[model samples]
Target: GNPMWERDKIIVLGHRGYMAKYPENSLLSIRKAIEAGADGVEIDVWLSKDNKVILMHAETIDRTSNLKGRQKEMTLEELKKANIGMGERIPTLEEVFEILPKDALLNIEIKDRDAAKEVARIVSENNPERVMISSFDIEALREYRKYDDTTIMGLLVDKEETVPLIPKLKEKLNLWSVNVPMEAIPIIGFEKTYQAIKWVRSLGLKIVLWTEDDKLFYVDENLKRLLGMFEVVIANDVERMVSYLSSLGIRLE
Candidate 1:
């Protein structure tokens, strides 16, 4: 029999909805990720001109979509003209929830503070299961927390310069998690990751590492230098990474 899922063992999260196999942030991609055995899927939330929450990463539509305009500048109807791979239109928060599995979790990142509360409300109402909300904008997270305290709130810390302020921010906001860049572990060493984890855990906070790439998989001798520090590993290649980690006895469940 499989053991119950533990919090310590690194959980695999599909970054941007399994970017390796399908279009990033596409609903089909998210379903594919969950079907492939990922613990959860992470996606970015942006607001359209009409204040509807949609699944998208960038502020502009140039890179991922056929349209070439700011996402905020276009209404949902207007944005629908843009192709999002396989002829899928950009999905609204409601549309995404309909397809997302009841057991599957989400790492929802709000792109703008102005829409934080609305996003939180919709996510909470849509997914009765656990959902972790995070953002680089600390204020946006703070605003999200104001509406719903039950959902886990995380801060995405990217720059080393922001490290000093994390402690204070965590204290004030009562954050449930800190999502840091994967390289920060080695750049600052295990000591820093451990210390940060210990510090946050003391206040009942979890630590998640984001944007972990092919290098951390230990597939190659040279890239095998760093492994086993993160509690949660966010990656685009969830199937390969999970299988690799499981082979090493790092069980996710």
Candidate 2:
């Protein structure tokens, strides 16, 4: 009956819409990601000054664009002026939704607590089955829950310290998965990491691994095995990871 766990193969989601090849969070990046055969794409969002939900990973546009101001402080029209290379401007959540097919998943990471309600409203008005909301901020996730309860949610926790909170958060938010960073395996040792994953699964939640600056696939045996254990992975390099999984005799949808 689950929407996510029913998948058999490792669902590879493009991190920031194939940011490795194009500007992160831009429409071009997202479209290219789908063209590359990724199961889905992950992106971040914030509420603009006029309450429009915009796709952007950073607090400000200075890093990825020509403009230099906080995203929340600028209106969508003002924020659109900055050119994210490839002549793409930062996209709105609605714009991205307009381009996605009915089957493709959109992992929307709520970067701002205020954006959660608006994002959830948009998802509710469209197809909730194809979207997954995740956030490092529990408050933001809570805000999303308030607006839409049917959409699947994931809790993003990077540090080992927050692993204990998964069970509680799972119950509160009705989370379908817990998104952990790939580095958790090396930092806490494989056995402990495996135990944590087992614990999360014991609570009836799936495990989703992610890497902001690292590739999910590695030549190392332990790392590769760990990556295989996960049903979903959000990575920077989709093509290489998909190819590696295929080499491991893993079928990808």
Candidate 3:
């Protein structure tokens, strides 16, 4: 499903699945996010030596798994052999698609544009409408757009920007949404998160926010409005965040 911009209730996207219980980007975590009631799950993808679209957050396997070496240096078999976390193996983009909830969305963060063509093909062959491909590599996204433009694409803002950068980029590429960090609002010393939201919403571009652990305070402080402001909220502890949001009388459904 695409962005439900007409409504303001908010949608919950499990960041790399339920990171609160399972390891980030782990297959178990992806499943756990769904079981815990995430409207969608977000994960990073890289190309293996064989060009397999494997799920991972880092270039090397040293951090997330027991394995070592860069992902592109490894083949699909070698990656599959690694013990990611809790005895779980590395999962492919296809595996995620098969397991993701039918009603849920999947935001595939393009970490390595080397596999952009493959990624576009896989998503198109699977479920193009339900996927949102986002990346800081907006250039790569543009090249990918040439390959397949049906995939809901968005621009990611990690650092500071000038003015009207969101709307300008969206119009330049005909983007469907814009993704920014939830903490970025405060990290850059902005007055309020909603101040940034207002600009993006004004252009009618759907918004997805990536958040960290300590920044979860919004649920208690300004949850109702925050939820009303953004269409999808990506959280490190996604299930727990959803729980907290629900406790605040915000219904995702």
Best by lDDT: 2
Instruction: Show where candidate 1 strays beyond 4 Å.
Output: 1-9, 185-204, 217-229
Cα lDDT tens digits, model 3, 1-253, are 4443334567777887777668888778987887777777889999999989999988899998987899988899988999988899999998888887664688899899887899998988776777888888877787678788777887887766523676677766778778867666556644555777777788888877776663544634644456556777787776567777778776643
Clash list (residue pairs), candidate 2: none
Q: List the candidates ranked by lDDT, beginning with the highest.
A: 2, 3, 1
| Tens-digit per-residue lDDT, 95-153, candidate 1 | 77788877677888898887786787787787634577889998888888788766767
Candidate that scores best on TM-score: 2
Candidate 3 residues lying further than 4 Å off, grouped into runs, are 1-8, 217-225
Residue 19 local lDDT, model 1: 87
Per-model TM against the reference: 0.86, 0.95, 0.90
Q: Is candidate 1 or candidate 3 better by lDDT?
A: 3
Residue 56 in candidate 3, Cα distance off native in Å: 0.5
lDDT of each: 0.75, 0.84, 0.77
lDDT for 126 (candidate 2): 70
